[PDB]
Enzyme design. Sequence first.
Site, PDB file in Angstrom:
ATOM      1  N   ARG A 109       0.801  -1.216   0.000  1.00 46.50           N
ATOM      2  CA  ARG A 109       0.000   0.000   0.000  1.00 46.50           C
ATOM      3  C   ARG A 109       0.837   1.272   0.000  1.00 46.50           C
ATOM      4  O   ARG A 109       0.261   2.365   0.014  1.00 46.50           O
ATOM      5  CB  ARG A 109      -0.949   0.001   1.204  1.00 46.50           C
ATOM      6  CG  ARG A 109      -1.924  -1.168   1.207  1.00 46.50           C
ATOM      7  CD  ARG A 109      -2.880  -1.103   2.387  1.00 46.50           C
ATOM      8  NE  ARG A 109      -3.836  -2.207   2.371  1.00 46.50           N
ATOM      9  CZ  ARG A 109      -4.774  -2.398   3.293  1.00 46.50           C
ATOM     10  NH1 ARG A 109      -4.885  -1.558   4.313  1.00 46.50           N
ATOM     11  NH2 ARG A 109      -5.602  -3.430   3.196  1.00 46.50           N
TER      12      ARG A 109
ATOM     13  N   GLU B 162      -3.584 -10.013   8.240  1.00 47.38           N
ATOM     14  CA  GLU B 162      -4.067  -9.145   7.168  1.00 47.38           C
ATOM     15  C   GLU B 162      -4.835  -7.982   7.794  1.00 47.38           C
ATOM     16  O   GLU B 162      -5.992  -8.125   8.191  1.00 47.38           O
ATOM     17  CB  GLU B 162      -4.936  -9.925   6.184  1.00 47.38           C
ATOM     18  CG  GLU B 162      -4.235 -11.106   5.541  1.00 47.38           C
ATOM     19  CD  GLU B 162      -5.075 -11.771   4.471  1.00 47.38           C
ATOM     20  OE1 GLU B 162      -6.172 -11.254   4.172  1.00 47.38           O
ATOM     21  OE2 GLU B 162      -4.641 -12.809   3.930  1.00 47.38           O
ATOM     22  N   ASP B 163      -4.159  -6.836   7.901  1.00 52.95           N
ATOM     23  CA  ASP B 163      -4.758  -5.574   8.330  1.00 52.95           C
ATOM     24  C   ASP B 163      -5.218  -5.608   9.783  1.00 52.95           C
ATOM     25  O   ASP B 163      -5.750  -4.616  10.289  1.00 52.95           O
ATOM     26  CB  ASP B 163      -5.932  -5.198   7.417  1.00 52.95           C
ATOM     27  CG  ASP B 163      -5.516  -5.039   5.967  1.00 52.95           C
ATOM     28  OD1 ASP B 163      -4.317  -5.224   5.666  1.00 52.95           O
ATOM     29  OD2 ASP B 163      -6.389  -4.730   5.128  1.00 52.95           O
ATOM     30  N   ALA B 164      -5.019  -6.732  10.464  1.00 51.42           N
ATOM     31  CA  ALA B 164      -5.429  -6.836  11.856  1.00 51.42           C
ATOM     32  C   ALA B 164      -4.426  -6.134  12.765  1.00 51.42           C
ATOM     33  O   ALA B 164      -3.259  -5.941  12.411  1.00 51.42           O
ATOM     34  CB  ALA B 164      -5.574  -8.301  12.264  1.00 51.42           C
TER      35      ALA B 164
ATOM     36  N   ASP C 275      -9.992 -10.112   4.019  1.00 51.52           N
ATOM     37  CA  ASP C 275      -8.835  -9.321   4.415  1.00 51.52           C
ATOM     38  C   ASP C 275      -8.940  -8.782   5.837  1.00 51.52           C
ATOM     39  O   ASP C 275      -8.062  -8.017   6.255  1.00 51.52           O
ATOM     40  CB  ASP C 275      -8.616  -8.163   3.433  1.00 51.52           C
ATOM     41  CG  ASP C 275      -9.917  -7.548   2.958  1.00 51.52           C
ATOM     42  OD1 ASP C 275     -10.991  -8.045   3.359  1.00 51.52           O
ATOM     43  OD2 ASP C 275      -9.867  -6.571   2.182  1.00 51.52           O
TER      44      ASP C 275
END
Lengths: 422, 50, 107, 99, 739, 50, 125, 248, 120, 50
Positions: D1, E702-704, J2
Amino acid sequence: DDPVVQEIDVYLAKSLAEKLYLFQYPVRPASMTYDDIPHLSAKIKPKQQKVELEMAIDTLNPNYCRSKGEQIALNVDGACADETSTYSSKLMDKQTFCSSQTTSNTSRYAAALYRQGELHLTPLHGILQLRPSFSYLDKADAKHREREAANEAGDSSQDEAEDDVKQITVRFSRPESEQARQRRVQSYEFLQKKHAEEPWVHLHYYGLRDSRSEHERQYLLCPGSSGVENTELVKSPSEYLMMLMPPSQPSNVLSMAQLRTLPLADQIKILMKNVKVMPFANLMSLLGPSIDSVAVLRGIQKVAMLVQGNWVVKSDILYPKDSSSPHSGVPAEVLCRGRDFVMWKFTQSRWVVRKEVATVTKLCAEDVKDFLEHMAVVRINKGWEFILPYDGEFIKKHPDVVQRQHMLWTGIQAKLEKVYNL
Amino acid sequence: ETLEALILKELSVIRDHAGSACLRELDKSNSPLTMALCGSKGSFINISQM
Amino acid sequence: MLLFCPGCGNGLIVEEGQRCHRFACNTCPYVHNITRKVTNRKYPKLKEVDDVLGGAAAWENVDSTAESCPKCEHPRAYFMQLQTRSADEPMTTFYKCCNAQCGHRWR
Amino acid sequence: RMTVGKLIELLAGKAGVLDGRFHYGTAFGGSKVKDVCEDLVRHGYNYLGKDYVTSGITGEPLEAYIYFGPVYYQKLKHMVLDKMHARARGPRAVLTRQP
Amino acid sequence: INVEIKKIMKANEKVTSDADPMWYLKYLNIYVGLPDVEESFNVTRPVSPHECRLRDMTYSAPITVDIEYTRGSQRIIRNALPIGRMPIMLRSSNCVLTGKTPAEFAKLNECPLDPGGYFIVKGVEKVILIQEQLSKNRIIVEADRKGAVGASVTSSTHEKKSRTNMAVKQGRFYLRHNTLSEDIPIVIIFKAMGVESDQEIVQMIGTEEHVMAAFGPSLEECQKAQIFTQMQALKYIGNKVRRQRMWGGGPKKTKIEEARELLASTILTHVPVKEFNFRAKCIYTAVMVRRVILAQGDNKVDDRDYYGNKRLELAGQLLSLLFEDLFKKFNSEMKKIADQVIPKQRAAQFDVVKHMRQDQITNGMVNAISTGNWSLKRFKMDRQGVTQVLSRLSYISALGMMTRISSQFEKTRKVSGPRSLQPSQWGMLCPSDTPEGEACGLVKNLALMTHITTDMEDGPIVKLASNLGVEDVNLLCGEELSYPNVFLVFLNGNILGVIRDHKKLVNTFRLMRRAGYINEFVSISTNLTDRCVYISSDGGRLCRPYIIVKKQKPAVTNKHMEELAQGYRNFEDFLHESLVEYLDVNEENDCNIALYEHTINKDTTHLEIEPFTLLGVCAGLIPYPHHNQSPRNTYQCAMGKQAMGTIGYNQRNRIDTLMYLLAYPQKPMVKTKTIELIEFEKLPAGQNATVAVMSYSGYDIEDALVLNKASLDRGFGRCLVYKNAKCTLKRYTNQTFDK
Amino acid sequence: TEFFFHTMAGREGLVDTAVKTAETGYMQRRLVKSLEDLCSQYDLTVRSST
Amino acid sequence: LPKDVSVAELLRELSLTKEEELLFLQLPDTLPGQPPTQDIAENACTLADLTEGQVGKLLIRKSGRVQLLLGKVTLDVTMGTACSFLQELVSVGLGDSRTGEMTVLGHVKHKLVCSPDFESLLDHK
Amino acid sequence: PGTQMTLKTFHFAGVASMNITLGVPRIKEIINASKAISTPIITAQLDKDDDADYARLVKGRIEKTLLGEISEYIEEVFLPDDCFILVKLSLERIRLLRLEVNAETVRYSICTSKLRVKPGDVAVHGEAVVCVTPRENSKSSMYYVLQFLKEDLPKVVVQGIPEVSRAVIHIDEQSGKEKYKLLVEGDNLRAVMATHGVKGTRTTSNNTYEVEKTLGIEAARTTIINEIQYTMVNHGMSIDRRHVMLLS
Amino acid sequence: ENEQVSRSQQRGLRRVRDLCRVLQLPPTFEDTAVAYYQQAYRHSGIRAARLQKKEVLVGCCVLITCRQHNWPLTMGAICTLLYADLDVFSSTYMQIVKLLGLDVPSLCLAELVKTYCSSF
Amino acid sequence: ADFDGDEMNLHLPQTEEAKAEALVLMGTKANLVTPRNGEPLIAAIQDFLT
Ligand SMILES: [Mg+2]
Ligand SMILES: [Zn+2]
Ligand SMILES: [Zn+2]
């Protein structure tokens, strides 16, 4: 770039002002002219200018088709009627040129006759565009329609006496609405009838080759001396700019343009209200050199006080008697007292601590901060210093003003010590 | 179109050469470089762009 | 070529006359006979192109040179980078390794 | 990102909480990395944010340095307490006998 | 409420009925007054907006009117009569909140930091979104669905809107209109418009060889028929005119006069005809056909997404149109009631004061604002979703929603053309800020520094243009249009005339505008490809301030900025002294702008004020946004529009259906200048936490993110949710009540 | 300018994926509704419903 | 034909030959003067309100600069639209109510345009 | 794979031209089995694939050529005896493009569905001179038909297949030998495989309906399988051949 | 029902509607007034009457409606909006309150003062 | 998925036959590869590869 050559004098003539018309043919190039064309008729109306020209064209020339001419002549008119015929002979001889009005106000357009060193201007009464109209085709169609009607009537060999009695029913006097009346007035038929109501005026044409043309050509000149100063046309550039472009008709909303259109007593008032710290030197430049210094002084002495040579707006000016504190809601009287105490502390010493004045005036921290941020800046390790330095030259040039300010400050300090119990 | 293609090729050559130089000058134990080598997330293109 | 009549400014057509073809108007009897040759060319566009393509010199208008492909690990390369993916945050590669005409095409 | 701006914000916030300042993150401007690096080297911390960190569980230091810093975290309205939904037999629709 | 409503009243000042003449109703004057509440029996009372929020009632002001009429042929006048209630927008001229101190805001239970700008109806807060629409009265050349390059003219006046289309389906130009049964050749229309010579028509179209070669088929098709006069062309058009099914006959023949009237006003409404003189309209359609011919070659197709052809309609124009429609309906109802009552009721006299239906306009406005559907049968405008419920998730959410703009497409088809980001949005709309989902590309936000122009008078503009050498269009033929050095000057789509040396004209007009005698919002642009000088003055245009740069030096110096900081001058003084001026998209298309001083070159006309003004309100919250990916910024704006936090100082007294508050809110450490400009630091929507960037325990795949138990125990992240539960006890028709 | 172009590319990708989702859903529904009647028989021959 | 210029136009009109020529010029709607006893409101000072005699001077400066002084201001004179069709100047003299003499003054070839110099006026005040 | 589809561009298959619809639109056009599709591609293999002369020869043979594209000028000549249209052919461009077209072939191209143009109307005077004399048809037609003739004559076919719109010469960079193939943007595979100099046994196409009607249902199925597999592989995702086999 | 509504009954109910709308009354007052009108129109002697009778009946119905929910409104302000005289209005009011005998609350003086002082 | 706030469904069969079919056919250990091309999908992911 100096105007070295060709200082042409511009003269004006009113001999043919209302008798000069500008005609142009958008379909005829400038190379070919109508000099050799024999003009027949020129029907023009004074009011509602719409000229109509009748040009004569030859037939024996090889460029003309005699058969098609005879055909179109027999189509437009009758066989041998000739009572109202668009052509005298059996050939298409006359050509109709119709005019259209370019613009209404032709006063800004003028004809410029150029001579050896002089230019004569003549106003134009009207400008029209001439185009080849097709009116014989409409008459031919109308005659075809009347022939069809005659054929419908004579469909039989002999027609008996018809009972074609016109039914006796006159049009009723119905009250017409305003909308329908306005539609009738704005209708094309009404305007066409109004234009047709004016009678035609037949004028005799005269070509360029005629001696009358050369006779009337000299009328565009004006009898006058070479150099004559005109009495008019002497307006200044400012007056010209004003007449060609006529006009239509926080507290610092007023701009400089709206500021200058105000008395000085209000100009300096709003200036001290917007800045709250203003030297006299720059105030002279802002007000303008046209204003004397004595008037500015007598005005600023009513809305401002002198502190260390700088003018600070009075407390009651910023805070009206009916307003209140936007941060605490306390009345404006206590705010004015606190601001006067701050100004007195500044007159006593150039450096003022926010804690001392906050403890003395018993006011909130935000109020003391808003008070000090007007005329002081945060100087580290020592508190606050005045935003502007000492103005000694203004004091030396005006000792009586400083004396009166000190006399007022004496009573101000007396009242402050009576209130705050210093 | 030939001019546009040539300009794109030159700019992309500059990009790829800068990316190669960055990958050569980057020392090991670098977390983005290690992640690009192991392929868990990201790639050499992202490292060159950053 | 479009011709107009001086009489009324209408369109002129060609019409066979009693002695010679002539330009005539459909509204007025004005006619104009033809004396000599009167031509009007157009000069349309000629297909000057040959439409040749596919040359290796013109094909190698790419950036990637002297890299390591994951198929044969040879310098030559032809990379394409795509960013048109929102579900997949990373970018997308397409490598074309071709010197001995291998034709490598993958993701 | 490619969120390097997050790292820059973290470094600026660390420098600010060290020197008691509010570094600006203005678009196409703001405080540069050199100023916050000088602030870090002045206050005694590392000029890159990475510091010597010991593991809390094992009690031994980590092999690689860890990136600590004050960042502005904001909580959203999307909570699991309002999104959790279970369905028993329950009621049904009148027209079609479905949930 | 101060200018347009008076014009609407003046347009319908006198209303009368056909039956019983000498009777009339004349409106003398109107007033809007201050907002009041009708809780008292026949008595008004000042009411605060917070009280309207609590009591679930609207916040409106009653309209007073003084009129004159006749009952028995006697002039009876009035002084103050209710006719309805206008909802009062907060912080407006008549709103009680304007010109108030924060203490006075506290006394009224209203937050001073509240941006306002929303109506209050039945206790709910509605916001009218900024509508975006294609500019009217402008020729649009575009490729047809079959691949042909055609044109369209959406001639819109204050009454009618007609879309005339052009067809090149068979190498010849046809004109298509809704009032016509079948498309007719353009040459027949030219012959019907007064000009009958083919040479003049060709000169008006152009003198280029390819232009004549392309226009030849049209002349041939016209010569196929025997149409050579204006009467025959009008007859053909009338034969091709649809049957309007109107009760009554035609003016003279019902075959030719109808076609003449359609050519006069119905076709090309924006083009005015003084007295049945289509010469200006002839030149306009000739220039249109010339543009179509030029586009038939090189594929220079105009794009709809170009914001120079866009207009932003605010709530003002929408409310004006709605009030005009409601007033016309009320006048029609009054006329019908009069025609029904006064003829045969009795000897007594009837008067309209007994039928002053005040509930009509009030209910219409309330329904249009609440339901959000706008129905204008006088113009066939059926819009929906204009008003939306203001999002009270946070201060940032409301501040961003107050500056939202919707698209005209409204998700009719996934064209993906307007949904893209165009260069025209520079400095006017926030590029990163956009809703995530199906609304991406159709809902946008305004920039931090922007302004929308208003309608002008166009009088002094025309006077200056006529004085600046613009020749009359009727004074010359169309052949001069084919010259390369001659340029065309227009005015809001209306053809104004021709000119030479357009550089001199543009420079003189810009200097006159900078002088102060011409409104600074009037825009001027030049198109060398089409050779047209556009003068735009209508409302809805987007303009941006810029510092004037002359001779490689800006007009604003350090001394001017010091005087501004000290308070000697303001922004209006910079506008007056020709130091800062507004520029439109079309105007800046021809100008050169520099981002910084080091980028200034010899050919520079204006200097950018500030680059970070490109971002809007939400994107300003992003610290160092130029170091991140653009989808990241978009997602960040979308999440910040939903981030929880403090709303205002009166959030405790506020009672909404759903409210989220933060227990220990903290202002950000890395704050943008936009944050200080919007005072977000006074109302934060988050906290500052010590974060570690590392992998731990495998629970942050994941994004946690892993939280600290002790941190959450000490108050970190604690939040409060406030819900509303409302109940009503109403009395029915029968004399019984709920207990 | 570079940020504006990057935002252009991001919005292009976003709208592309937004259209692609719906188009793929529609084509998937059509294909599965078409190919639902096929089954693997015991005689190693794929037969239709009839 | 190449595009000409007003300075060279006047040069060939006077220096090259002494033959006269009929010209047509557009003037501003308002002139820098007051209508003398013409019963006015800052209206347009048309040419009909003025009298005979010299009213201004046509100046030709270096580098092709051409101006027209009409008192205290100087207007700029340029070439208008180059007409190619037949533009003739004639006078319709209605000497009698039902009889009039139309005199063909000549043919118009060029068109001049005069515009106020707003730049100089703004630089002044 | 539609979910993971990128809908990218720049995949010109190595020719930097010939924009072809690939991806979800291509899959939709394939599964719809429409008779007419967007951008039909025809691949043709030649015998003398190493020589470019024969390649351009067969290209001009298969590619539709308009009269205005080869004629240097067409002029309406008005003579005192009669007026007609004179077309001058550019023999240099004819021999440059290797078009087997002379004055007789041009004359034979005329009189083919053009308002009943009789053979006696068209005449040949020189090597590259064509004369067309107008004659009225008496059905709303007169001697002033030169406009229609001048408008519709440059758009007549003189050599090639009318269905063929654009044909390009692709080359292969094989190390063994460089061969030439033809990429035709037409929808007539029969005419392509029937033309002289083209190896019809190795001519493929993209239009499923044309391939079907030309070479049988089995060839149609094989072409469908090949096209689907090619379109799937070109975008980075792989599908087992058994799935597309079952679909076909 | 609602289809056996004469043109005169429709005129009467529309008169009730416009009368309660010009007074800026809530829709509950309109509902109660139309209910009272439909209830009073059930009598044979009421339905067979002149337009003056229907109009004064509408006036008395809206008067009773405002009297119910503590809404003070003098009979003069109502007769001002009626095309009739107050004497016949009062006579019909007495007749209908003698025929129906509905609840008639007393006019409150405090609310009347509140309504009357604000008019100045 | 996700783990960015996406909601997930969970269905519980009410029949032993349905439970057995779910365990056998839709078993996680029995569907480690996709039927599209045989490539495994359930494998190591980010923070596990590195
Ligand atoms: Mg997700
Ligand atoms: Zn003619
Ligand atoms: Zn390799």
